[PDB]
Write a protein that binds this DNA or RNA. Sequence first.
RNA 1: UGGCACCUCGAUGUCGGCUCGUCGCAUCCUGGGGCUGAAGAAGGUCCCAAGGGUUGGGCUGUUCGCCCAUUAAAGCGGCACGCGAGCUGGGUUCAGAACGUCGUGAGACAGUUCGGUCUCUAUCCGCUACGGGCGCAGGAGAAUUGAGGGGAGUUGCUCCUAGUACGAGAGGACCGGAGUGAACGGACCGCUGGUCUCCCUGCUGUCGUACCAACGGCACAUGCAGGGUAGCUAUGUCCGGAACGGAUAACCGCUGAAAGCAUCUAAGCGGGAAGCCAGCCCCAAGAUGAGUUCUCCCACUGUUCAGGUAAGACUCCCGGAAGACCACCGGGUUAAGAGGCCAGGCGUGCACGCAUAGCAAUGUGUUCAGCGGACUGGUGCUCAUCAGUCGAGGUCUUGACCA
RNA 2: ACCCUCGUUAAGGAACUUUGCAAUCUCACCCCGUAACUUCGGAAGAAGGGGUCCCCACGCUUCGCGUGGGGCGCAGUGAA
RNA 3: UGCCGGCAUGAGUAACGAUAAAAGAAGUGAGAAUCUUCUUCGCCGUAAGGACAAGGGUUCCUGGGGAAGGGUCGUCCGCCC
Lengths: 58, 114, 125, 205, 132
Amino acid sequence: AKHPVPKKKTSKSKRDMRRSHHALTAPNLTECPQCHGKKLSHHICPNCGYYDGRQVLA
Amino acid sequence: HGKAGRKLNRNSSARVALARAQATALLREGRIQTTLTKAKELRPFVEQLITTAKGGDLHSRRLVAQDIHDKDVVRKVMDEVAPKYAERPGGYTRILRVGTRRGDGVTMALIELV
Amino acid sequence: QTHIKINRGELLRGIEQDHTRQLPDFRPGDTVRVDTKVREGNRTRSQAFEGVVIAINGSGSRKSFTVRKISFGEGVERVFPFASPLVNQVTIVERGKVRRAKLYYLRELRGKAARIKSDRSRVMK
Amino acid sequence: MKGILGTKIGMTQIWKNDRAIPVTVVLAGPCPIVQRKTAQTDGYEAVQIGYAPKAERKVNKPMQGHFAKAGVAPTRILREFRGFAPDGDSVNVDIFAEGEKIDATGTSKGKGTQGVMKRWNFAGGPASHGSKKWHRRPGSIGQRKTPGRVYKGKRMAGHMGMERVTVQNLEVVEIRAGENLILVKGAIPGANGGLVVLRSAAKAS
Amino acid sequence: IMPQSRLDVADNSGAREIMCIRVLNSGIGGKGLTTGGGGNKRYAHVGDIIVASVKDAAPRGAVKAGDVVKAVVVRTSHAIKRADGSTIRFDRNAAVIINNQGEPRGTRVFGPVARELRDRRFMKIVSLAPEV
RNA sequence: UGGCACCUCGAUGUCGGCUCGUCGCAUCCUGGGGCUGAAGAAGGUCCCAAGGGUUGGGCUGUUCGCCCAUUAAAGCGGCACGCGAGCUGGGUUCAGAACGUCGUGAGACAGUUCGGUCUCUAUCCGCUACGGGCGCAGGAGAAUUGAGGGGAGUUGCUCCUAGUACGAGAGGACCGGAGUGAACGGACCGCUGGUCUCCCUGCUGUCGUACCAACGGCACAUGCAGGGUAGCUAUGUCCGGAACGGAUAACCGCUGAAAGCAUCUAAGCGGGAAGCCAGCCCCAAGAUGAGUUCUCCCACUGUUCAGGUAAGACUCCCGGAAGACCACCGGGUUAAGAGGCCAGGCGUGCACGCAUAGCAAUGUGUUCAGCGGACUGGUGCUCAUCAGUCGAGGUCUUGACCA
RNA sequence: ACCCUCGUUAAGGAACUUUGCAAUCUCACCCCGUAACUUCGGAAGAAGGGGUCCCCACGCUUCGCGUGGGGCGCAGUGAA
RNA sequence: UGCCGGCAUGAGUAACGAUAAAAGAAGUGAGAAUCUUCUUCGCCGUAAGGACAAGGGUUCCUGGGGAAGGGUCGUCCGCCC
């Protein structure tokens, strides 16, 4: 049992305009509460370990 | 589709048989580490049950006893868990991240005190 | 869109009871020798009093109340959850210390007529 | 050519000497705020504006739209159409009596690209044997090789319909004491806490 | 309503076994015989006509054996509620013998009947109606 | 039903059945019209365009077909007599056997009969969707009027001037009227129900607590009997095609020409139901045929080169009856957003201790509450210190216009 | 979405369809109870009726049932 | 529409294998979720036990290292010495 084989292909031309509707979101937004610079999307260090107060640990 | 909240991924018999050999590592230890959802729907259990732990009865020690198969679950809930915070309704241990698994993405906190 | 930061539910529970004015009866007490009875319709009026000779049982939830938990026997069964909220019906009756089965609805039984189904529910089999 | 306001919540309500059906809706009065003329901005118009928020830390651009001879905080906007009316609030208890055949409208329901079996409600095609087809599919929907552009029909999966349903005729219940209530009888659209523009009798005589 | 359909005591003519299957109507209460009427539905109402399957028979007094004839019905068990925040319904109902033309042979109904058959152009319905 | 054998045998598999069906009209049932050897009731043939729509049983593989009742009536020619990139083979048409005559026998028959695998990782054109962006020229949150792309229509039945015009007698209208129904658009939870895979009670068997009232692991991921909220959808309930203007076909005129009479003289105009403009909604002035408004940043200088200074989009923390992701929403503390705790229903319906009849299985009492997955909420506690990304001031020309 | 797998229904129980394969339903032990046909040994271990757990005057009782007053639940070999 | 050798694309999707539950403390170190010392869970246990029969011949160990394999990989192998 085989469903219509490949035949025609899609090398160049196409397979180009396919790294843009996704790619990677591109970031570099924030740089930590106070010291140094990590932070993530709303999330404390591991440096000083804090958004503004006591947490995590060096 | 549905919504509201409160679901279940891990087994359907894992709702009265899971933290009973998972979150049980909290009576004598407390170094609990289990999902970024479990814990969030685990509060409705830990800090939850305590009103019948304020003192000591018997029925207040049933599915308070046999619900977390152990000893400290009763031999400490009375005079060391409930009273440990018998002044503030809900809200105590600071569950959060810890450093993920490195590979996939699942953090699991720690739970502690003082 | 109807969600922000305001609690408007005194229509859903206020204006709701802005029209009520009744302390029903609220007796689920089964097997009574006489009870309430609808005002009927039919002619101009001729507001008669012989709807159905109920046993009285049930409760419900807000303006709905599946009242009837009665039916009969000449017509096999036949329940018809009537509206507890109405201003066109006789103002009930209540009697019977009642050996209470389950109260509220049942659905089961309701065919196990035979004879020993007077005002009790326990059985040995 | 009057009121417009937030859906949210329904129930069954007393009628004469019974219970019937019923539906309900909540409201307030966003107030006009803007009023121009007929010179650009086209016909008559108006712009609804206001409900229940804290637009302070919202943005610093919409806060200026909010400016005429009124205050407090606004949430949504929208408009109505041509017509004449005072400069007050939204409510079915304005100047036009009680007992009107208003015609609501609703958005959607929280779904997400599903089958035509739903877009047509009938997915006939007995398949109690073989299971190559789980009955969910219409099937056929095709012919030979004489062209074929799938037409523009085919209600296949996609994105459903936050679009306007315009319910038309839907009787009113009762007007009671309170800062405006308003209710109706007959489902009423808009998923739970909707909004609804609410519109005057359109039926064609 | 519905083709076959199992029930209980019928017109009390004879037997405790009856039938029905086909539906007929025209919105009258006893006109006669014409070409058509209505019944594009999938069931019935209550005080309808319904070409019911004869199946059985009665002893021997004015009713035949194999018989065959456009029988009728009584009540149903589908849709409609009593308006009074309640309902009125069975899960069986009966039949009663009612002339093809529409001349309710109503000998002596026994057991409870219907109250909703008082807008269904009752006429010979509700008279000897036992329980109501 | 075919005459042709033109490419299709590097191979396009009968027919029919469910469903999707969407086209055409010559119109299968409405509509307004020609006539009717038609009094009415109801038809008999024809004119015009699609606005809609057209059953269930019996057999078959059935196209077809007739038999039963319905249906306003049950169409005709579409589509390789629609289609397995659906299934089905069910007939029969693949190899087995039997019958009927036959060939001497092996064997022959769109002659009859019994069973008799059935495809296949969808790049895609294209279609139902949501996003990455680019965009009519400063950058932006959002509110807007629009071509137009689609959705967008069927019908029996009571009562009334109706027991009338008509009919010598049975019976019964051109107009519409409130009224009962169907497959058929949605909606909505609060009349009806299920669904609930963990909240309880009921029971056999096995174990862990030594052991017992008392409970848990296994019996589909609740074992078995039942119950269940937030949600979903049908049998749940309401609404669905009806005013009306331009202008039709069938038809009816005002003056009646040219052949001095007349006919709707196409020379002036009206009455004409359904399509078409419109009237209900999405989309959408990026329809490149760039439409309007509320709203935020800037009076400086250095890598035809050139800065120290942003508010709106956003990583996001806890969440949404919103969902793959995601366009829309709620708090980031000037703090009530999910969870715990708490007033209350909720369902297992009267938990546990203890005393007793006493062989005692069990029962009474204190408890219609003990027990309660997302419930109107409350508590700002389990969480919220903070930290970042477009770091910028209207292109050419001519006009209404400003001192 | 859909998809294989499982369970529970208001309204009719095969009208579905080539025909209840499938699906799903359903068939305890003891006692009494039991056909047209029939080579009578059968067709039926048919259909159908009561119970089977518990305190007890009581057996071959180191294990069943049993004339009885009665106990729990809507239902008792009750799950398989 | 050849044949082998290599690059291919179907495309990063379908899929990791019978859907017969698992959490964690701690050893280690290169970080550890699937190793190791271990309390809790559950599936089979007329079995998916142990011995004899055929087979593979190097399985078992004192253990050791990722080039590669065990269709993730891994500080586990019965890989390799």
